[PDB]
Design a protein around this ligand. Structure first.
Ligand SMILES: Nc1nc2c(ncn2[C@@H]2O[C@H](COP(=O)(O)OP(=O)(O)O)[C@@H](O)[C@H]2O)c(=O)[nH]1
Ligand SMILES: [Mg+2]
Length: 164
């Protein structure tokens, strides 16, 4: 069993918890306590490898250690929250600085894609992710669209960066 240490970051309210809980429990939780920061484990087979994902859902001693030793990052904004998208810069800078590197496994996630009349269009997100050299994936924690894709792609990005 190979462990992968994953960190979910982004502005409060974007769906970091709802995404994590979909991955772990396959349901959509409407109002998960926005103050709870914790780690979760999930056993999953990805490309014939049995993975034990160690995931921090950020909301701290524990956060500092996951930032320092985390292998990959899901940087989440919501497609109907322009501010959360603009804030991605701050999260990306935080990660670059803890790892002293521009080359960190990361996926840009645009969540809440089930909601109408987005204020962040897909091209804007593609543009930002292209500048950072990382994938962009749309998700809905409500419908589960893209949830497995976002996490599996992050695991693949970690492999692309380092032997595991
Ligand atoms: N419609 C929709 N609502 C969502 C989605 N993800 C999260 N939410 C809602 O957005 C709010 C914040 O979600 P939450 O997971 O707590 O965000 P966190 O602070 O980033 O962990 C809650 O009301 C969730 O039900 C989604 O993909 N679609
Ligand atoms: Mg949360």
């Amino acid at each position: 069993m190979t462990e992968y240490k994953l960190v979910v970051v982004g502005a409060d309210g974007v769906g970091k918890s709802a995404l994590t809980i979909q991955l772990i429990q396959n349901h959509f939780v409407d109002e998960y306590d926005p103050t709870i920061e914790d780690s979760y484990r999930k056993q999953v087979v990805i490309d014939g490898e049995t993975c034990l994902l160690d995931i921090l859902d950020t909301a701290s001693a524990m956060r500092d250690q996951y930032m320092r030793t985390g292998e990959g990052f899901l940087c989440v904004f919501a497609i109907n929250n322009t501010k959360s998208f603009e804030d991605i810069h701050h999260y990306r800078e935080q990660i670059k600085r803890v790892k002293d590197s521009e080359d960190v496994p990361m996926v840009l996630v645009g969540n809440k894609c089930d909601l109408p009349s987005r204020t962040v269009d897909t091209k804007q997100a593609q543009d930002l992710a292209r500048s950072y050299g990382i994938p962009f994936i749309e998700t809905s924690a409500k419908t589960r669209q893209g949830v497995d894709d976002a996490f599996y792609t992050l695991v693949r990005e970690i492999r692309k960066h380092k032997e595991k």
